[PDB]
């Protein structure tokens, strides 16, 4: 039994925290939808 429950509006937030790197990676995508590093 899977069910869904609303959790918010889809909105951009001016007060969002900022974080995370911006890496550039070579990858491949196989038929199962799995990414792997090249």
């Amino acid at each position: 039994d899977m069910y869904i429950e609303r959790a918010g509006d889809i909105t951009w937030e001016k007060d969002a925290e900022v974080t995370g790197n911006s890496p550039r990676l070579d990858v491949a995508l196989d038929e199962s939808g799995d990414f792997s590093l090249v």
């Binding site: 039994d1 899977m2 069910y3 869904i4 429950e5 609303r6 959790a7 918010g8 509006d9 889809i10 909105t11 951009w12 937030e13 969002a16 925290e17 900022v18 974080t19 995370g20 790197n21 911006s22 890496p23 550039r24 990676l25 070579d26 990858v27 491949a28 995508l29 038929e31 199962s32 939808g33 990414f35 792997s36 590093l37």
Partner: protein, 154 residues
């Protein structure tokens, strides 16, 4: 129930519920990643949502209608992950995407590592448009997860 918004995807086992992912309701259609539901029907209140389209390679599925989300990352601007973590209110995390470089072109990617039940959380551009869903990606270093910005075709 089809009111636009971000939704938790919950599963009830024999004992207790857990959050297995997240999805986007837009224009009457529910959008999530294939691996979250594996195409199974969903309950929404007293109603049933039946799968309509799905593709394992893109890792996407839509319910009640064809895929409606068509915005794409502009390749330059910051974006926001609208993460819906299990047990917590939705929150916006702003980041500059990196890039997955593939033989068939580049794909934006966010180096953000949230709990597994966050898969299907939408990534937003500065106008609030959903440019893709979070949760299919790679691990680079030790535990450093990087998610593709996965978008379908409207």
């Amino acid at each position: 129930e089809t009111t636009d918004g971000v939704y938790r995807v919950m599963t009830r086992r024999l004992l207790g519920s857990t959050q297995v992912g997240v999805g986007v309701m837009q224009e009457g259609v529910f959008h999530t990643m294939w691996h979250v539901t594996k195409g199974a029907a969903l309950r929404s209140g007293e109603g049933r949502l039946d799968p309509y389209w799905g593709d394992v390679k893109q890792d996407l599925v839509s319910y009640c209608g064809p895929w409606k989300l068509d915005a794409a990352w502009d390749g330059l601007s910051e974006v926001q992950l609208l993460a819906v973590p299990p047990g917590e209110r939705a929150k916006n995390i702003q980041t500059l995407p990196g890039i997955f470089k593939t033989k068939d072109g580049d794909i934006g990617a966010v180096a953000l590592d949230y709990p597994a039940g966050t898969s299907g959380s939408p990534i937003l551009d500065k106008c609030g448009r959903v440019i893709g869903l979070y949760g299919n990606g790679v691990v680079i270093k030790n535990g450093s997860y990087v998610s593709a910005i996965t978008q379908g075709k409207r």
